[PDB]
Amino acid sequence: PDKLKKVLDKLRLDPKDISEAAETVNKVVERLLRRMQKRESEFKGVEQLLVGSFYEKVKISAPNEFDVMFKLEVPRIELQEYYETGAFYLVKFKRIPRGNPLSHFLEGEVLSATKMLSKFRKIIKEEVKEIKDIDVSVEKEKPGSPAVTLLIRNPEEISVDIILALESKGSWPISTKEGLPIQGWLGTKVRTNLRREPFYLVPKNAKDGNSFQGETWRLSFSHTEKYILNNHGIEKTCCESSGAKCCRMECLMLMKYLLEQLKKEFQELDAFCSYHVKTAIFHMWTQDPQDSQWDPRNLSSCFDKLLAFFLECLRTEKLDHYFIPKFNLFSQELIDRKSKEFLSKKIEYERNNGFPIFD
Ligand SMILES: [Zn+2]
């Protein structure tokens, strides 16, 4: 209780420090954006997913890291499910446009994610080289990442992930039909309105051995996930000025920070990522939908039942993608059986000893 609240103080974003990064992040992102929007650029139609504010780009439990999506509203595309996860797809056009630059990235009828990302990376590398009023560099490509990560230092280093994405305003793929099970929690009108919004595809960028590995795209619901984080209560006034504070976000920050610390010491946890944590708490928020089940006075009790739920996902080797029920993020083919039992052992140790890793 007293220890968990003390850890949250160092994780909470100082509005004075996050504002100083807003000027630098916006300036660099805007410059790269207007570079992509030139006549020669094949990404001339690209736009920013979340525009206006700056907390939409910051990553929780990560004060110096930021995510930005560069979305491209392509013509009417047709999706082809690539293997039976429901998250990965080949992308074709219903009618290939005549003078569109995206045709340069076609491998037959399918749009090549890896070629688009390569040319995406080059245009970014060229523009950041011309940046001399602020030290900006392009980090080496992370395997499996759809993003071109920038390294900005003035004076402390901050990270900006520039994610390439296709925007589709068509209907969400059929694999999501039973996903987003928020009816008892956020309600059916929220779920209907959310599923009227676009969906996004990002390069899988995974050397999986398939013949279409460079043409594979992954479903992204980062916009829907951000909405849920900002609108996480059954009552509309949850965490508002005239409402009651809850500890949902604090439990997520604690769980995310507990995993990232365990990952820095043990390489056996490399297959785990913070998305497993956000997926797990989404299911927890669906299981415990009442705002009173997340009272800030029960912080320790709420953080403990999140750990127990997570350990239950490791034990059963089952963690369905919140938007794609058929996609088990904890299947053997994605995470080894020994890694789950290892993470379970370490979490039980931290849980039983007052979390010594937070010292
Ligand atoms: Zn709340």
Coordinates of C-alpha atoms and ligand atoms in Angstrom, one line a residue:
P1 CA 0.0 0.0 0.0
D2 CA 2.5 2.6 1.1
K3 CA 5.1 1.0 -1.1
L4 CA 2.9 0.8 -4.1
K5 CA 1.9 4.4 -3.8
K6 CA 5.5 5.4 -3.5
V7 CA 6.3 3.6 -6.8
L8 CA 3.5 5.3 -8.6
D9 CA 4.9 8.7 -7.7
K10 CA 8.0 8.1 -9.8
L11 CA 6.0 6.6 -12.6
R12 CA 3.4 9.5 -12.9
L13 CA 4.2 12.0 -15.6
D14 CA 5.3 15.4 -14.3
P15 CA 3.4 18.0 -16.4
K16 CA 6.4 20.3 -16.4
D17 CA 8.7 17.7 -17.9
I18 CA 6.3 16.2 -20.4
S19 CA 5.4 19.6 -21.7
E20 CA 9.1 20.4 -22.6
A21 CA 9.1 17.2 -24.7
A22 CA 5.9 18.2 -26.4
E23 CA 7.6 21.1 -28.2
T24 CA 10.5 18.9 -29.5
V25 CA 8.4 15.9 -30.4
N26 CA 5.8 17.9 -32.2
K27 CA 8.4 19.9 -34.1
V28 CA 10.3 16.7 -35.3
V29 CA 7.0 14.9 -36.1
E30 CA 5.6 17.8 -38.0
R31 CA 8.8 18.2 -40.1
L32 CA 8.8 14.5 -41.0
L33 CA 5.1 14.7 -41.8
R34 CA 5.5 17.6 -44.3
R35 CA 8.4 15.7 -45.8
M36 CA 6.2 12.7 -46.5
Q37 CA 3.6 15.0 -48.0
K38 CA 5.7 16.2 -51.0
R39 CA 5.1 15.5 -54.7
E40 CA 7.9 12.9 -55.0
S41 CA 6.9 11.0 -51.9
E42 CA 4.9 7.8 -52.3
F43 CA 3.3 8.5 -48.9
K44 CA 1.9 11.9 -49.8
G45 CA -1.5 11.0 -48.4
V46 CA -0.1 10.1 -45.0
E47 CA -1.6 11.8 -41.9
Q48 CA -1.1 11.6 -38.1
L49 CA -3.5 9.3 -36.2
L50 CA -3.9 11.4 -33.0
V51 CA -3.5 15.1 -33.6
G52 CA -3.8 18.0 -31.2
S53 CA -2.9 17.0 -27.6
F54 CA 0.3 15.4 -26.5
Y55 CA -0.7 12.8 -23.8
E56 CA -2.1 10.8 -26.7
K57 CA 1.5 10.1 -27.8
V58 CA 3.1 9.4 -24.5
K59 CA 3.4 5.8 -23.3
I60 CA 2.2 5.1 -19.7
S61 CA 4.9 3.8 -17.3
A62 CA 7.5 5.2 -19.8
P63 CA 8.1 8.9 -19.3
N64 CA 10.7 9.3 -22.1
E65 CA 9.0 7.2 -24.8
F66 CA 6.3 8.3 -27.4
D67 CA 4.3 6.5 -30.1
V68 CA 3.1 8.2 -33.3
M69 CA 1.2 6.5 -36.1
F70 CA 1.6 7.8 -39.7
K71 CA -1.7 6.5 -41.2
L72 CA -2.4 6.3 -45.0
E73 CA -6.0 6.1 -46.1
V74 CA -5.5 3.8 -49.1
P75 CA -8.3 3.0 -51.6
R76 CA -10.8 0.2 -51.1
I77 CA -8.7 -2.7 -50.0
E78 CA -9.6 -6.4 -49.8
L79 CA -8.2 -8.4 -46.8
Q80 CA -7.0 -12.0 -47.0
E81 CA -6.5 -13.8 -43.7
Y82 CA -2.9 -15.1 -43.7
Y83 CA -3.0 -18.2 -41.5
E84 CA -5.6 -18.8 -38.8
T85 CA -4.8 -16.2 -36.1
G86 CA -7.2 -13.6 -37.4
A87 CA -4.6 -10.8 -36.8
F88 CA -2.4 -11.2 -39.9
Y89 CA -3.5 -10.4 -43.5
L90 CA -2.4 -10.0 -47.1
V91 CA -3.7 -6.7 -48.5
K92 CA -5.0 -6.3 -52.0
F93 CA -6.9 -3.5 -53.7
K94 CA -10.4 -4.2 -54.9
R95 CA -9.4 -2.2 -58.0
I96 CA -5.7 -1.3 -58.4
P97 CA -5.6 2.5 -59.0
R98 CA -3.9 3.8 -62.1
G99 CA -1.7 6.6 -61.0
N100 CA -1.2 5.8 -57.3
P101 CA 2.3 5.5 -55.9
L102 CA 1.3 2.5 -53.7
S103 CA 1.3 0.4 -56.9
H104 CA 5.2 0.5 -56.7
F105 CA 5.0 -1.6 -53.6
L106 CA 2.8 -4.3 -55.1
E107 CA 4.0 -7.9 -55.3
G108 CA 1.6 -9.1 -57.9
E109 CA -1.8 -8.2 -56.3
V110 CA -0.6 -8.0 -52.7
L111 CA 0.8 -4.8 -51.1
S112 CA 4.3 -5.4 -49.7
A113 CA 4.6 -4.3 -46.1
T114 CA 8.4 -4.7 -46.0
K115 CA 9.0 -2.7 -49.1
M116 CA 6.7 0.1 -47.9
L117 CA 8.5 0.1 -44.5
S118 CA 12.0 0.2 -46.1
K119 CA 11.1 3.3 -48.2
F120 CA 9.3 4.7 -45.2
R121 CA 12.6 4.3 -43.2
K122 CA 14.7 5.9 -45.9
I123 CA 12.6 9.1 -46.2
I124 CA 12.8 9.4 -42.4
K125 CA 16.5 8.8 -42.2
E126 CA 17.1 11.5 -44.9
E127 CA 15.0 14.1 -43.1
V128 CA 16.5 13.6 -39.7
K129 CA 20.0 14.0 -41.1
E130 CA 19.0 17.6 -42.1
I131 CA 17.9 18.2 -38.5
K132 CA 20.8 20.2 -36.9
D133 CA 19.1 22.4 -34.2
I134 CA 18.3 19.2 -32.2
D135 CA 20.2 15.9 -32.1
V136 CA 17.9 13.3 -33.8
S137 CA 19.0 9.9 -34.9
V138 CA 17.2 6.8 -36.3
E139 CA 17.6 3.7 -34.1
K140 CA 18.5 0.4 -35.8
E141 CA 15.4 -1.5 -37.0
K142 CA 13.9 -3.6 -34.3
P143 CA 12.8 -7.0 -35.7
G144 CA 9.1 -7.5 -35.7
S145 CA 8.5 -3.7 -35.2
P146 CA 6.3 -1.7 -37.7
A147 CA 7.9 1.5 -36.5
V148 CA 10.9 3.7 -37.3
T149 CA 12.1 4.7 -33.8
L150 CA 13.8 8.1 -33.5
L151 CA 16.2 9.0 -30.8
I152 CA 16.0 12.6 -29.6
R153 CA 18.3 14.0 -26.9
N154 CA 18.0 17.5 -25.5
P155 CA 19.4 16.9 -23.0
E156 CA 18.0 13.6 -21.8
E157 CA 17.2 10.9 -24.4
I158 CA 13.6 10.5 -25.5
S159 CA 12.2 7.9 -27.9
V160 CA 9.6 8.5 -30.7
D161 CA 8.2 5.5 -32.5
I162 CA 6.9 6.4 -35.9
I163 CA 4.5 3.6 -36.9
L164 CA 3.5 3.1 -40.5
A165 CA -0.1 2.1 -40.9
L166 CA -2.8 1.6 -43.5
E167 CA -6.2 3.1 -42.5
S168 CA -9.3 1.3 -43.7
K169 CA -12.7 2.9 -43.1
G170 CA -14.4 -0.3 -44.2
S171 CA -16.0 -2.7 -41.8
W172 CA -13.8 -4.5 -39.2
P173 CA -12.6 -8.0 -40.2
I174 CA -14.8 -10.9 -39.3
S175 CA -12.3 -12.2 -36.8
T176 CA -13.2 -9.4 -34.5
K177 CA -17.0 -10.1 -34.5
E178 CA -17.0 -11.4 -30.9
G179 CA -14.0 -9.3 -29.8
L180 CA -14.1 -6.1 -27.7
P181 CA -16.5 -7.7 -25.1
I182 CA -17.3 -4.5 -23.4
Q183 CA -21.1 -4.8 -23.3
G184 CA -21.4 -5.3 -19.5
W185 CA -18.7 -2.7 -18.8
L186 CA -18.6 0.2 -21.3
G187 CA -21.9 -0.8 -22.9
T188 CA -23.3 -1.7 -26.3
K189 CA -23.6 1.9 -27.6
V190 CA -19.9 2.5 -26.9
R191 CA -19.0 -0.9 -28.6
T192 CA -21.2 0.0 -31.7
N193 CA -19.7 3.5 -32.0
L194 CA -16.1 2.1 -31.6
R195 CA -16.7 -0.5 -34.3
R196 CA -17.9 2.2 -36.7
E197 CA -14.4 3.8 -36.5
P198 CA -11.6 2.8 -38.9
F199 CA -9.2 -0.1 -38.3
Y200 CA -5.5 -0.1 -39.0
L201 CA -3.0 -2.5 -40.5
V202 CA 0.7 -2.2 -39.6
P203 CA 3.6 -4.2 -41.1
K204 CA 4.2 -7.5 -39.3
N205 CA 7.9 -7.2 -40.2
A206 CA 8.6 -10.7 -39.0
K207 CA 11.0 -13.1 -40.7
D208 CA 8.7 -16.0 -40.1
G209 CA 9.8 -18.0 -43.1
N210 CA 6.6 -17.7 -45.1
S211 CA 6.7 -16.8 -48.7
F212 CA 4.6 -13.8 -48.0
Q213 CA 6.4 -12.7 -44.8
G214 CA 7.3 -9.3 -46.2
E215 CA 3.7 -8.9 -47.5
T216 CA 2.0 -9.7 -44.1
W217 CA 0.1 -6.9 -42.3
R218 CA -1.0 -7.0 -38.6
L219 CA -4.3 -5.6 -37.3
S220 CA -3.9 -2.6 -35.0
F221 CA -6.5 -1.1 -32.6
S222 CA -4.2 1.4 -30.9
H223 CA -6.9 4.1 -31.3
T224 CA -9.6 2.0 -29.7
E225 CA -7.2 0.9 -26.9
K226 CA -6.4 4.6 -26.2
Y227 CA -10.1 5.4 -26.0
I228 CA -10.7 2.6 -23.6
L229 CA -7.8 3.8 -21.4
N230 CA -9.3 7.3 -21.3
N231 CA -12.9 6.1 -20.9
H232 CA -12.4 3.1 -18.6
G233 CA -15.2 3.5 -16.0
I234 CA -18.7 2.2 -16.0
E235 CA -19.7 5.6 -14.7
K236 CA -19.0 8.5 -17.2
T237 CA -17.5 10.6 -14.4
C238 CA -14.8 8.0 -13.4
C239 CA -11.5 9.9 -12.7
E240 CA -13.1 13.2 -13.7
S241 CA -13.1 16.4 -11.6
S242 CA -16.7 15.9 -10.4
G243 CA -16.4 12.1 -10.2
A244 CA -14.7 9.3 -8.2
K245 CA -11.1 8.4 -8.7
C246 CA -10.4 4.7 -9.5
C247 CA -7.1 2.7 -9.5
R248 CA -7.5 1.0 -12.9
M249 CA -4.7 3.0 -14.6
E250 CA -2.5 2.8 -11.5
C251 CA -2.8 -1.0 -11.5
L252 CA -1.8 -1.0 -15.2
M253 CA 1.2 1.2 -14.6
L254 CA 2.3 -1.1 -11.7
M255 CA 1.8 -4.3 -13.7
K256 CA 3.6 -2.9 -16.8
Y257 CA 6.5 -1.6 -14.7
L258 CA 6.7 -5.0 -12.8
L259 CA 7.1 -6.8 -16.1
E260 CA 9.6 -4.3 -17.7
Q261 CA 11.9 -4.6 -14.6
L262 CA 11.7 -8.4 -14.6
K263 CA 12.6 -8.3 -18.3
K264 CA 15.7 -6.1 -17.8
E265 CA 17.3 -8.8 -15.5
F266 CA 16.1 -12.1 -17.0
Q267 CA 16.5 -12.8 -20.8
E268 CA 14.0 -15.7 -20.4
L269 CA 11.2 -13.0 -20.5
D270 CA 12.1 -11.6 -23.9
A271 CA 9.0 -13.1 -25.5
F272 CA 6.8 -11.1 -23.2
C273 CA 5.8 -7.5 -23.9
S274 CA 3.7 -4.8 -22.3
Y275 CA 0.9 -5.6 -24.8
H276 CA 0.3 -8.9 -22.9
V277 CA -0.2 -6.7 -19.8
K278 CA -2.6 -4.3 -21.4
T279 CA -4.5 -7.3 -22.9
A280 CA -4.7 -8.9 -19.5
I281 CA -6.0 -5.8 -17.7
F282 CA -8.6 -5.3 -20.5
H283 CA -10.0 -8.8 -19.6
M284 CA -9.7 -7.9 -15.9
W285 CA -11.7 -4.7 -16.4
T286 CA -14.3 -6.8 -18.2
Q287 CA -14.4 -9.3 -15.4
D288 CA -14.7 -6.6 -12.7
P289 CA -16.7 -3.9 -14.5
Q290 CA -17.8 -1.9 -11.5
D291 CA -15.9 1.3 -10.6
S292 CA -16.2 0.3 -6.9
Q293 CA -14.1 -2.9 -7.6
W294 CA -11.2 -0.5 -8.4
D295 CA -11.4 1.9 -5.4
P296 CA -8.0 3.6 -4.8
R297 CA -8.1 2.5 -1.2
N298 CA -8.0 -1.1 -2.3
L299 CA -4.9 -0.4 -4.5
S300 CA -2.9 -3.4 -3.1
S301 CA -6.0 -5.7 -3.3
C302 CA -6.7 -4.6 -6.8
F303 CA -3.1 -4.9 -8.0
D304 CA -3.0 -8.4 -6.4
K305 CA -6.1 -9.7 -8.2
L306 CA -4.6 -8.4 -11.4
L307 CA -1.4 -10.5 -10.7
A308 CA -3.6 -13.5 -9.8
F309 CA -5.5 -13.1 -13.1
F310 CA -2.2 -12.8 -15.0
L311 CA -0.8 -15.8 -13.3
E312 CA -4.0 -17.6 -14.3
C313 CA -3.4 -16.7 -17.9
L314 CA 0.2 -18.1 -17.7
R315 CA -1.1 -21.3 -15.9
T316 CA -3.8 -22.0 -18.5
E317 CA -1.5 -20.8 -21.4
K318 CA -4.5 -18.7 -22.6
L319 CA -4.6 -14.9 -23.2
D320 CA -7.0 -14.1 -26.0
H321 CA -6.4 -10.9 -28.0
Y322 CA -9.0 -8.5 -26.7
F323 CA -10.2 -7.7 -30.2
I324 CA -9.5 -11.1 -31.8
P325 CA -10.8 -13.9 -29.6
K326 CA -9.3 -16.7 -31.7
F327 CA -5.8 -15.2 -31.3
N328 CA -4.2 -16.7 -28.2
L329 CA -1.2 -14.5 -27.4
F330 CA -0.1 -17.2 -24.9
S331 CA -0.1 -20.2 -27.3
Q332 CA 2.9 -22.5 -27.4
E333 CA 3.8 -21.4 -30.9
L334 CA 4.2 -17.8 -29.7
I335 CA 5.6 -18.2 -26.1
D336 CA 7.4 -21.4 -24.9
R337 CA 5.9 -23.3 -22.0
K338 CA 9.0 -22.9 -19.9
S339 CA 8.9 -19.1 -20.2
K340 CA 5.4 -18.9 -18.8
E341 CA 6.3 -21.1 -15.8
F342 CA 9.4 -19.0 -15.3
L343 CA 7.4 -15.7 -15.3
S344 CA 4.9 -17.3 -12.9
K345 CA 7.7 -18.3 -10.5
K346 CA 9.2 -14.8 -10.5
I347 CA 5.8 -13.0 -10.1
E348 CA 4.9 -15.3 -7.2
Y349 CA 8.3 -14.4 -5.6
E350 CA 7.7 -10.6 -6.0
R351 CA 4.1 -11.0 -4.9
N352 CA 5.0 -12.9 -1.7
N353 CA 7.9 -10.7 -0.6
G354 CA 6.5 -7.2 -0.9
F355 CA 7.9 -6.7 -4.4
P356 CA 11.6 -6.2 -3.6
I357 CA 12.3 -5.5 -7.3
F358 CA 10.7 -2.0 -6.8
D359 CA 13.5 -0.9 -4.5
Ligands
ZN1 ZN -11.2 5.8 -13.3

